[PDB]
Amino acid sequence: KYPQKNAELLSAQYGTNLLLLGVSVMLALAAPVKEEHLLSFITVLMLVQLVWMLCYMIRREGASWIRGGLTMLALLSLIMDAFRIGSAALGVYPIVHALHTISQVHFLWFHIYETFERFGVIHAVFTNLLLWCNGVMSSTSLYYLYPFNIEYHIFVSAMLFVMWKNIGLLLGPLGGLVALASSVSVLVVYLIHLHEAAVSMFYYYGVAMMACMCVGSGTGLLVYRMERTLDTELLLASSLGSWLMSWCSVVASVAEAGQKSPSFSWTSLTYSLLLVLEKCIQNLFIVESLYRGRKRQILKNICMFLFMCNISLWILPAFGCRPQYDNPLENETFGTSVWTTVLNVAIPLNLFYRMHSVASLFEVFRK
Amino acid sequence: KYPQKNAELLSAQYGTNLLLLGVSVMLALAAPVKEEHLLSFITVLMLVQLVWMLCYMIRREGASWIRGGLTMLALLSLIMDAFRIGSAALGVYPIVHALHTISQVHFLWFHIYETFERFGVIHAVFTNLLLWCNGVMSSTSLYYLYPFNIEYHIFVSAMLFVMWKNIGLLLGPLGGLVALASSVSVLVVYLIHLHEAAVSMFYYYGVAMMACMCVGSGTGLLVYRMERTLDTELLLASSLGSWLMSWCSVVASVAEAGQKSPSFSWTSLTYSLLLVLEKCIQNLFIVESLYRGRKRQILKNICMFLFMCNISLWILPAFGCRPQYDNPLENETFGTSVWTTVLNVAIPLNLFYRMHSVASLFEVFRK
Numbered sequence: 049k050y051p052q053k054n055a056e057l058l059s060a061q062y063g064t065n066l067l068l069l070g071v072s073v074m075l076a077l078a079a080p081v082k083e084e085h086l087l088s089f090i091t092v093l094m095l096v097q098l099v100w101m102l103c104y105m106i107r108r109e110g111a112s113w114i115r116g117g118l119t120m121l122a123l124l125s126l127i128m129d130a131f132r133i134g135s136a137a138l139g140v141y142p143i144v145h146a147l148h149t150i151s152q153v154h155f156l157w158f159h160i161y162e163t164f165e166r167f168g169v170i171h172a173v174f175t176n177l178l179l180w181c182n183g184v185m186s187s188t189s190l191y192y193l194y195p196f197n198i199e200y201h202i203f204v205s206a207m208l209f210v211m212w213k214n215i216g217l218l219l220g221p222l223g224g225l226v227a228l229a230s231s232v233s234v235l236v237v238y239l240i241h242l243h244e245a246a247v248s249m250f251y252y253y254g255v256a257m258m259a260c261m262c263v264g265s266g267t268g269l270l271v272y273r274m275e276r277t278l279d280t281e282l283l284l285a286s287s288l289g290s291w292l293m294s295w296c297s298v299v300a301s302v303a304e305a306g307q308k309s310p311s312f313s314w315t316s317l318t319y320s321l322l323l324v325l326e327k328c329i330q331n332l333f334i335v336e337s338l339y340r341g342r343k344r345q346i347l348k349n350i351c352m353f354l355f356m357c358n359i360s361l362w363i364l365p366a367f368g369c370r371p372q373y374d375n376p377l378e379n380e381t382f383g384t385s386v387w388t389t390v391l392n393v394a395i396p397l398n399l400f401y402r403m404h405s406v407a408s409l410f411e412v413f414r415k
Numbered sequence: 416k417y418p419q420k421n422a423e424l425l426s427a428q429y430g431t432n433l434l435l436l437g438v439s440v441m442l443a444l445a446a447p448v449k450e451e452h453l454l455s456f457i458t459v460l461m462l463v464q465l466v467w468m469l470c471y472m473i474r475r476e477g478a479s480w481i482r483g484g485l486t487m488l489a490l491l492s493l494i495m496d497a498f499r500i501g502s503a504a505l506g507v508y509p510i511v512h513a514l515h516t517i518s519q520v521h522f523l524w525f526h527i528y529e530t531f532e533r534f535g536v537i538h539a540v541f542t543n544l545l546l547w548c549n550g551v552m553s554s555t556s557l558y559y560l561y562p563f564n565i566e567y568h569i570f571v572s573a574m575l576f577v578m579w580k581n582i583g584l585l586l587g588p589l590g591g592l593v594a595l596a597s598s599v600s601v602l603v604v605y606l607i608h609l610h611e612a613a614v615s616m617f618y619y620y621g622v623a624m625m626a627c628m629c630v631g632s633g634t635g636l637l638v639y640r641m642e643r644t645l646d647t648e649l650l651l652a653s654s655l656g657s658w659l660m661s662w663c664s665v666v667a668s669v670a671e672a673g674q675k676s677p678s679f680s681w682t683s684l685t686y687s688l689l690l691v692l693e694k695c696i697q698n699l700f701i702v703e704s705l706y707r708g709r710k711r712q713i714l715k716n717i718c719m720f721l722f723m724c725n726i727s728l729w730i731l732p733a734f735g736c737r738p739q740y741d742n743p744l745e746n747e748t749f750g751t752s753v754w755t756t757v758l759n760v761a762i763p764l765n766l767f768y769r770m771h772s773v774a775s776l777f778e779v780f781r782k
């Protein structure tokens with residue numbers, strides 16, 4: 049029996065104080081508070097969300113890219129758990145976590161207003177946000193699945209928040225197929241030699257692709273000039289992670305350049321600035337396309353090229369080719385813990401952004 | 416000659432990469448990058464904003480609470496600068512900063528669309544946000560003015576962002592006057608003895624006032640139940656700082672309680688939880704009032720009481736009574752650098768929130 053304005057503010061205050069409590073626990077942990085205390089806290093929050101989901105289901109009883117999105121990242125998370133399962137907080141957390149993931153997908157697939165529902169969904173938003181934060185701050189198969197569990201817990205947090213926020217074609221695919229074959233070659237050569245040559249190859253390949261995407265998107269923008277809020281916000285919020293990764297690399301490269309060090313190399317400076325520029329241009333192209341016969345064929349070739357390039361760029365870190373963690377300079381300017389966390393944020397965000405863009409470019413291409 | 420959607424996204428991307436660059440510099444500094452490099456970076460950004468403001472002015476040539484808000488906090492900032500003025504980056508920064516503050520107030524008072532204006536205002540938003548972040552991370556008069564320069568640089572950042580986001584009465588004043596006289600007594604007694612007794616007095620006084628405000632706001636909510644977006648967002652965003660301060664204190668108090676330490680005291684646990692509860696209740700009361708004869712007199716007495724209590728609570732940290740920095744427990748669980756930064760965020764946010772609430776309660780009272 050609350051006014052809607054009070055139901056929304058009270059739910060927001062509950063959720064934000066839940067986040068700030070998680071923040072307090074994480075700060076206390078890094079500085080009395082042990083890993084078991086943070087795991088126990090989030091485990092309890094998952095148990096609370098599970099109780100809400102069960103009660104909700106009892107009371108109740110072109111999105112294929114999004115449903116297949118979280119179903120794949122949840123299956124990958126369940127695989128990760130299965131590996132971890134096979135202190136009390138460490139022993140219990142993966143069980144509650146697996147149940148949380150299973151119920152979270154079941155609910156979002158089939159059961160996606162009262163104050164009960166608003167508190168439930170806000171709780172879920174900040175539970176998944178805290179799960180992201182924990183995945184980022186805290187056998188060998190757990191390495192490759194790491195970005196997929198983290199992007200699972202940022203995707204689902206967005207999926208839950210935005211739910212209530214609302215409430216001829218020749219050159220394109222040829223360039224795309226070449227970029228994909230080259231990306232696969234870079235991926236396998238890098239993994240086989242897991243060395244320095246493969247890293248340099250990776251960065252030169254990256255620069256070449258980022259420059260080609262800048263040209264493609266710029267051409268599309270010129271065509272539009274001479275002649276959906278959530279998609280823009282999701283592209284920008286996700287790309288911010290990669291823009292921090294890039295600015296950290298740029299700052300470290302400039303700091304090295306200022307000393308006239310013999311180790312300075314343009315491949316760690318031009319690439320990061322190019323990543324920021326290309327993403328700014330692509331974000332503007334994609335949103336312009338979403339707010340909209342030679343021009344049609346040109347735009348289709350551009351979207352097909354960018355689509356394929358974004359898939360190839362998603363593929364690189366998605367399959368284990370993440371050399372940024374081993375950078376000899378960024379791990380000295382910021383240290384290993386800061387560089388590692390910045391990448392732990394940026395990489396799963398970069399995977400999200402590179403598959404978001406692929407879905408938006410696909411839609412633009414079809415129409 | 417940009418579409419409005421592209422003008423807004425491109426400006427947002429410029430501003431956010433400006434923030435992420437400032438983030439990169441601050442991380443690099445804490446971990447190659449010295450204080451002079453961060454001061455130089457922000458000094459240059461202030462010079463850029465000054466150039467924009469001059470070009471803009473050349474091209475061009477119930478808000479009294481807000482205009483008097485930033486005019487007072489800018490005069491206090493100029494006083495702080497005057498004290499600092501009387502490495503090259505340290506010598507130059509206060510001059511550019513003073514000019515920035517003077518032009519920022521001149522512009523906001525008298526000169527508060529083209530892409531030029533959008534890039535200019537977004538730059539100013541993230542320049543002031545970076546200035547806040549620097550004031551928080553990095554004679555004796557500089558102590559007392561510290562929260563006012565920091566809240567200046569968070570107030571003005573909000574003032575600039577929201578600009579474009581938009582584009583009978585017996586018991587009340589008697590309780591208020593008693594709360595004010597008691598707050599002044601606590602303030603002067605604390606400062607005179609600048610000791611442990613004054614701190615305990617402060618915390619017991621705080622708890623007594625927070626409980627009285629909870630009763631007042633709860634009564635007002637009951638009256639409304641038995642019978643403006645930016646204001647809600649500013650109250651919540653500002654109160655978040657105090658909710659982090661409170662949860663850090665609560666976590667430290669619980670960690671101490673879990674060890675059965677003889678030093679555990681309820682005054683550091685009940686107060687922080689009460690601060691969170693009272694603010695949640697008051698935020699819901701104020702927004703309910705903004706979205707709206709015995710009931711009228713009751714509501715006027717409640718608003719008058721809360722108005723006076725929020726002034727008294729603003730007065731306590733505003734005049735130097737900030738004992739939270741000396742807490743013997745929160746500075747051990749989180750360390751001195753983390754507890755100090757959490758308070759450097761929360762206190763100027765608490766001052767903002769406690770004068771925001773006073774302006775909203777004043778408006779509600781008059782009508």
Ligand SMILES: CC(C)CCC[C@@H](C)[C@H]1CC[C@H]2[C@@H]3CC=C4C[C@@H](OC(=O)CCC(=O)O)CC[C@]4(C)[C@H]3CC[C@]12C
Nearest residue numbers: 070071072074075076077078079177181185385750753
């Ligand atoms: C962007 C929104 C949605 C918030 C999500 C991220 C937060 C949960 C992040 C932001 C800043 C993070 C903190 C930033 C700073 C620190 C201090 C740092 O402390 C040290 O490592 C100090 C080491 C020493 O000197 O002993 C460790 C990480 C920690 C606790 C981080 C934990 C998680 C925080 C609160």
Ligand SMILES: CC(C)CCC[C@@H](C)[C@H]1CC[C@H]2[C@@H]3CC=C4C[C@@H](OC(=O)CCC(=O)O)CC[C@]4(C)[C@H]3CC[C@]12C
Nearest residue numbers: 288292382383385386389390393431434435438442446
């Ligand atoms: C919301 C946007 C517009 C603001 C930009 C900043 C945020 C996106 C924050 C939230 C998550 C933060 C990161 C999360 C955690 C850390 C941990 C911290 O590293 C450590 O945990 C250990 C410190 C050490 O011992 O070196 C360094 C800061 C960093 C990378 C933070 C950098 C700033 C981030 C990206």
Ligand SMILES: CC(C)CCC[C@@H](C)[C@H]1CC[C@H]2[C@@H]3CC=C4C[C@@H](OC(=O)CCC(=O)O)CC[C@]4(C)[C@H]3CC[C@]12C
Nearest residue numbers: 383386437438439441442443444445446544548552752
């Ligand atoms: C909320 C939005 C609007 C962003 C505004 C705040 C950011 C500018 C904050 C968020 C997290 C902050 C960082 C969090 C973590 C660190 C790591 C910390 O590093 C250490 O102290 C490690 C010490 C050591 O182990 O040697 C110092 C502060 C710093 C750089 C902070 C600098 C400023 C950051 C990026």
Ligand SMILES: CC(C)CCC[C@@H](C)[C@H]1CC[C@H]2[C@@H]3CC=C4C[C@@H](OC(=O)CCC(=O)O)CC[C@]4(C)[C@H]3CC[C@]12C
Nearest residue numbers: 064067068071075079655659749750752753756757760
């Ligand atoms: C946007 C909301 C909903 C997310 C909640 C977190 C944010 C509000 C961030 C931005 C500013 C952050 C703070 C800014 C800086 C620091 C510095 C850091 O302390 C240090 O600088 C030194 C670390 C050490 O050596 O102990 C500890 C984290 C803390 C308090 C951060 C805690 C989390 C805050 C409040």
Ligand SMILES: CC(C)CCC[C@@H](C)[C@H]1CC[C@H]2[C@@H]3CC=C4C[C@@H](O)CC[C@]4(C)[C@H]3CC[C@]12C
Nearest residue numbers: 120121124188189192193196239365366367368
């Ligand atoms: C559209 C699909 C691909 C979505 C994401 C699924 C990902 C996580 C799957 C796809 C195929 C998998 C890879 C194929 C085989 C190898 C070689 C081995 O030595 C290390 C693991 C590794 C490298 C696997 C890791 C996980 C993997 C990358």
Ligand SMILES: CC(C)CCC[C@@H](C)[C@H]1CC[C@H]2[C@@H]3CC=C4C[C@@H](O)CC[C@]4(C)[C@H]3CC[C@]12C
Nearest residue numbers: 487488491555556559560563606732733734735
């Ligand atoms: C509405 C007004 C008050 C807005 C804010 C102005 C503030 C910053 C002004 C008001 C009066 C001032 C105080 C009055 C006198 C003293 C005693 C001296 O030993 C330390 C400084 C100190 C404690 C001053 C600090 C700054 C001050 C707190």
Ligand SMILES: Oc1ccc(-c2nnc3n2Cc2ccccc2OC3)cc1
Nearest residue numbers: 113114116117120203399400403404407
């Ligand atoms: O056949 C597939 C299906 C999905 C993915 C995938 N994996 N992660 C993500 N998606 C999809 C997605 C959809 C919308 C917005 C963002 C986003 O990014 C997350 C991969 C292969």
Ligand SMILES: Oc1ccc(-c2nnc3n2Cc2ccccc2OC3)cc1
Nearest residue numbers: 177202205206209281282285286397400
């Ligand atoms: O990989 C990503 C990263 C960020 C977003 C995103 N973009 N806008 C929003 N989020 C997420 C979010 C989550 C919890 C609370 C607030 C909040 O803010 C809304 C999406 C995908």
Ligand SMILES: Oc1ccc(-c2nnc3n2Cc2ccccc2OC3)cc1
Nearest residue numbers: 202285288289290291292293393394435
């Ligand atoms: O450099 C970055 C920048 C942003 C993130 C990030 N990822 N998810 C979230 N943010 C913060 C954010 C930014 C805009 C809107 C909402 C929101 O909240 C959730 C990470 C690294």
Ligand SMILES: Oc1ccc(-c2nnc3n2Cc2ccccc2OC3)cc1
Nearest residue numbers: 480481483484487570766767770771774
């Ligand atoms: O006579 C005065 C006038 C202003 C202040 C003051 N000082 N700081 C702040 N204000 C005012 C204010 C107004 C609207 C929203 C927030 C807010 O908070 C900032 C004090 C005495």
Ligand SMILES: Oc1ccc(-c2nnc3n2Cc2ccccc2OC3)cc1
Nearest residue numbers: 544569572573576648649652653764767
């Ligand atoms: O003391 C405060 C603290 C926060 C707010 C506030 N509330 N909502 C917003 N801000 C400020 C802001 C500043 C820069 C970029 C984005 C942004 O987000 C909007 C106000 C007063």
Ligand SMILES: Oc1ccc(-c2nnc3n2Cc2ccccc2OC3)cc1
Nearest residue numbers: 068569652655656657658659660760761
């Ligand atoms: O515990 C806290 C929580 C928040 C802040 C803070 N202060 N100013 C800003 N935030 C972050 C924020 C939160 C909501 C909307 C915008 C926004 O951005 C600016 C500080 C301490």
